[PDB]
């Protein structure tokens, strides 16, 4: 199919052929599986002290004093799971493998399929992104990689009738629950993904909900955050081309 390239003013400037991968049939299940793996693989191993609650010579008196056979020390019950200060029966364990494997084939396939999801205006609208455009993804001249001010990327977007999505991601959510106490107080909608070719868009990265990525290593997470296909993306003339062989 055709891809309408845009200049930094937002005006049409020719058009290239939309590579084949964007025709890969959208497989949300595989995409989901690839996002799950990526998210699990970055989780850190944890677990309670191996000797927590065992640091005691407590012993049970046995029968004879009308007391349950519970190891005690200085008249205080100890060690056993049902005892306050006793060990945790089946606690979390450092040894546990919290990683998920995934076949390179299955994973690359999901990358392709996520890509394709990007080229369907309807999907991208369902995923929830806000925009008033008919073509998608949004392809732009490699000159974009030269921008430096965020403000300039804004204008470009407003001209491309896509800024409405950043308006969407311009709202932080203060989470329910104690994540808060661990430094996860906030969270925000995901907005536009900018895929360039030489380096990630320094000028676009700070944009609300935006994520910047490069064609050679852009992945399923960026392409489909939370495993949900159809993220409002903007490729670079060159990027678009590179992506084709992924």
């Amino acid at each position: 199919m055709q891809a309408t390239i845009y200049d930094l003013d937002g005006n049409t400037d020719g058009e290239v052929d939309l590579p084949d991968v964007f025709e890969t049939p959208v497989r949300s299940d595989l995409i989901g599986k690839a996002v799950r793996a990526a998210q699990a693989n970055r989780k850190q191993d944890y677990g309670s002290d191996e000797y927590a609650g065992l640091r005691t010579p407590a012993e049970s008196f046995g029968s004879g004093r009308g007391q349950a056979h519970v190891p005690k020390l200085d008249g205080r019950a100890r060690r056993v799971p049902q005892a306050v200060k006793g060990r945790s029966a089946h606690p979390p364990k450092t040894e546990k493998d919290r990683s998920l494997d995934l076949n390179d084939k299955e994973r690359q396939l999901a990358v392709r399929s996520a890509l394709a999801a990007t080229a369907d205006a309807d999907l991208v609208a369902d995923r929830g992104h806000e925009f008033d455009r008919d073509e998608v993804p949004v392809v732009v001249s490699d000159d974009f990689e030269d921008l430096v001010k965020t403000q300039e990327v804004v204008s470009l977007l407003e001209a491309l009738d896509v800024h409405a999505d950043i308006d969407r991601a311009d709202e932080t959510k203060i989470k329910a629950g104690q994540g808060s106490a661990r430094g996860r107080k906030y969270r925000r909608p995901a907005s536009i993904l900018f895929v360039t070719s030489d380096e990630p868009s320094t000028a676009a990265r700070n944009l609300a909900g935006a994520d910047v990525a490069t064609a050679s290593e852009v992945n399923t997470e960026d392409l489909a955050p939370g495993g949900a296909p159809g993220r409002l993306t903007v490729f670079t003339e060159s990027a678009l081309a590179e992506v084709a062989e992924r």
């Binding site: 808060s180 106490a181 661990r182 430094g183 107080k185």
Partner: protein, 119 residues
């Protein structure tokens, strides 16, 4: 440290000299223009205007600056004790704005003017 516990910790256990930065206040438009800084370490000489408390709006001369508790006493911003005495109602520099500076310190004025350092 992106972790809340550490953030708060470091702020509460910061050595004396590192507390100065905790008693900083925004500078009036005129002054920001004049010294090329957005704020300054409020001193017991400056004049300042209350921007947020129950005293928001009032102005006065900074009477005291406590580095341990990171708070300042502004003249006339007080509380009525039971016995009738009048005592200062501590203020957080963050709800305050400096409108006049006491530059009796060569050093302070130096820093203020230089463009490579802030006071």
């Amino acid at each position: 440290s992106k972790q809340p516990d550490k953030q708060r910790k470091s702020q509460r256990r910061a050595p004396l000299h590192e507390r100065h930065k905790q008693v900083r206040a925004t500078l009036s438009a005129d002054l920001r223009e004049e010294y090329g800084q957005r704020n300054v370490r409020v001193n017991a000489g400056d004049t300042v205007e209350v921007l947020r408390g129950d005293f928001a709006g009032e102005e006065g001369e900074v009477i005291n600056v406590d580095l341990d508790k990171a708070v300042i006493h502004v003249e006339d911003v007080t509380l009525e004790k039971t016995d009738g005495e009048e005592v200062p109602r501590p203020l957080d520099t963050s709800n305050v704005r400096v409108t006049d500076l006491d530059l009796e310190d060569e050093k302070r004025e130096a820093r203020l003017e230089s463009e490579d350092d802030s006071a």
